[PDB]
């Protein structure tokens, strides 16, 4: 054909069918899915729907607060960076033999959010007892409508795929207790959550509210000066996020000793190194809080490393990795006609005006 840049591979136009994706035992073929999605292939829409809703029925049966054994690989934000998610699985271990816990923010910002969701939901269907997914602040209607996810679904699939995702996101658990030692959440603590029972009591099956404990678990952050406070305030309103709170070092230590925990493992803030360890608890000598962030070269500009945490009896191995190549997309998943046509219109008309004048 007359295709100019031959070296560039061409996405497949064939859309994967139900028999290609699911074998006759009901198990997704994740290898086949991985290869197709890496090529910017699509599923038939009914097949994407089946993955989304079958994942959601597994999520719906899980508790608000998950009980997760060591060893486990704990991952922070992904934000639609599907090609880095492929590398993450190499760094962290095969889901076939590694327990995983993801801490939310699978979608928005990166242009491959639906591929991340289809892949992780497929993995959840295949490994229901060893792969765990928490809710992040982006996994809701309000943010995906303002950021890119709703538009991504409209252009790649349809709004039914979007609506099914929104129902699936409502079923995501809010928190995990890992190795009976760590509380894992996307954002952090609430002035209304003093015990683990306070998490178990929540009704999670809804759009996150604008305030309250569910909001706080997904949205709160440590103080900028966490550990080095001169504000004896445990929870101060989070003016950067516009909701929820900043929590202080004494707030965290209070929660930890009250509940006999070692640390809070959370995500939600980008880190140059892919992780950050905060001030040690004096009772234990271990960081009171750790942020993990798993999106390398975030937004294609931060130039950060990503990391995951591989926790195993008596050792926290933090494993860093760098970004991988990914395909180009115009803003808002615009096609080249929509992008260029107004300019074409004005430039032809302008030519003729100058010729006729």
């Amino acid at each position: 054909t007359d295709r100019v840049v031959k070296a560039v591979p061409f996405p497949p136009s064939h859309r994967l069918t139900a028999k290609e994706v699911f074998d006759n035992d009901g198990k997704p073929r994740v290898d086949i899915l991985k290869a197709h999605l890496m090529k910017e292939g699509r599923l038939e829409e009914s097949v994407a729907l089946r993955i989304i809703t079958e994942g959601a029925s597994i999520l719906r049966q899980e508790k608000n607060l998950l009980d997760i054994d060591a060893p486990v690989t704990v991952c922070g934000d992904i934000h639609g960076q599907f090609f880095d998610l492929m590398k993450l699985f190499e760094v962290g271990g095969s889901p076939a033999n590694t327990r995983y816990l993801f801490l939310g923010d699978y979608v928005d910002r990166g242009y491959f959010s639906i591929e991340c969701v289809l892949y992780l939901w497929a993995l959840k269907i295949l490994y229901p007892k060893t792969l765990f997914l928490l809710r992040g602040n982006h996994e809701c209607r309000h943010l995906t409508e303002y950021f890119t996810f709703k538009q991504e679904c409209k252009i790649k699939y349809s709004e039914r795929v979007y609506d099914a995702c929104m129902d699936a996101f409502d079923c995501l658990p809010l928190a995990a207790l890992m190795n009976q030692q760590f509380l894992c959440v996307h954002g952090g603590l609430s002035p209304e959550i003093n015990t683990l029972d306070d998490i178990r009591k929540l009704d999670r099956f809804k759009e996150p509210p604008a305030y309250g404990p569910m909001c706080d678990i997904l949205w709160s952050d440590p103080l900028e000066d966490f550990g080095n406070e001169k504000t004896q305030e445990h929870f101060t309103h989070n003016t950067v996020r516009g909701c929820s709170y900043f929590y202080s070092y004494p707030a965290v230590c209070e929660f930890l000793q009250h509940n006999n925990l070692l640390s809070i493992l959370r995500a939600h803030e980008a880190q140059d190194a892919g992780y950050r360890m905060y001030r040690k608890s004096q009772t234990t000598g271990f960081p009171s809080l750790i942020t993990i962030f798993s999106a390398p070269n975030y937004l294609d500009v931060y130039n950060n490393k990503a990391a995951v945490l591989k926790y195993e009896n008596n050792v926290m191995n933090i494993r860093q990795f760098n970004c991988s190549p990914h395909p180009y997309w115009l803003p808002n998943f615009m096609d080249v006609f929509t992008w260029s046509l107004p300019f074409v219109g004005e430039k032809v008309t302008e030519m003729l005006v100058n010729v006729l004048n």
């Binding site: 960081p287 191995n317 860093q320």
Partner: peptide, 11 residues
Amino acid sequence: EPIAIIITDTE
């Protein structure tokens, strides 16, 4: 019993 942290790159 203070657990150890080991940080390595993969890349």
